[PDB]
Amino acid sequence: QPIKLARVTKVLGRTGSQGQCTQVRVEFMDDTSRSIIRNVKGPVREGDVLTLLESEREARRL
């Protein structure tokens, strides 16, 4: 699976067990007009670029 780059569109909040993780919404740099929800560790703000090794996983899935 190719490595993907994503841009942070909305910072949703602090989740995880201890609040350490951050739920954000990200959109791919590809012209696919897609957007998913991801968990980030560390200080993250609007406009940041994330490297996804596997882009298929969803943070909030049954």
Partner: protein, 190 residues
């Protein structure tokens, strides 16, 4: 005029190959300085240390453990000597080597922790670019510190070899092994 680090290392030829880390590594024309000693206040506000030049960040991070606290001129001299050694051994711009080492040493995915008394359970998560840069600098400094300890080898030499190996991508460096193990743990429990 042209601004060169230590009066001899240019910054125009230095380029960053990672799009994500372009906004968090301050080496370009506006952040080009003659010395990594500016007496600034970069910890005053959140996200402000991304505006600190990366050489000054390395100099700040090399003031450990304790026996080196507050001695910044010594660390500046160490960094200057390490850059000279890097240029002698490889023949390229030491700034480019430092940038490549920081790019390669940064983990891309980490693992979050849900822990009780019995066992701790484990999940994979992503890493923000600022934490990537911070952890890369920390790993490089720790590797140099542990390599120089109780050994006949100057801390500047060990730092030079750590940067050379990390920019090379070789597994001989401490930071590369730590990043690989963290990424393997994150991958194994997706």
């Amino acid at each position: 005029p042209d601004i060169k680090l230590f009066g001899k290392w240019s910054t125009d030829d230095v380029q960053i190959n990672d799009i994500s880390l372009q906004d968090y590594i301050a080496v370009k024309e506006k952040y080009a300085k003659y010395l990594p000693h500016s007496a600034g206040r970069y910890a005053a506000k959140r996200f402000r240390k991304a505006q600190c030049p990366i050489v000054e960040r390395l100099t700040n991070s090399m003031m450990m453990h304790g026996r080196n606290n507050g001695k910044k001129l010594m660390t500046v001299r160490i960094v200057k000597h390490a850059f000279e050694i890097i240029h002698l051994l490889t023949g390229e711009n030491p700034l480019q080597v430092l940038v490549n080492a920081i790019i390669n040493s940064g983990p891309r995915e980490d693992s979050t922790r849900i822990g009780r008394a019995g066992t701790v359970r484990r999940q994979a998560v992503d890493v923000s670019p600022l934490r990537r840069v911070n952890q890369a600098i920390w790993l490089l400094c720790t590797g140099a510190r542990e390599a120089a300890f109780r050994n006949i080898k100057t801390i500047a030499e060990c730092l030079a070899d750590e940067l050379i190996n990390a920019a090379k991508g070789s597994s001989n460096s401490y930071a590369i092994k730590k990043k690989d193990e963290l990424e393997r743990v994150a991958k194994s429990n997706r």
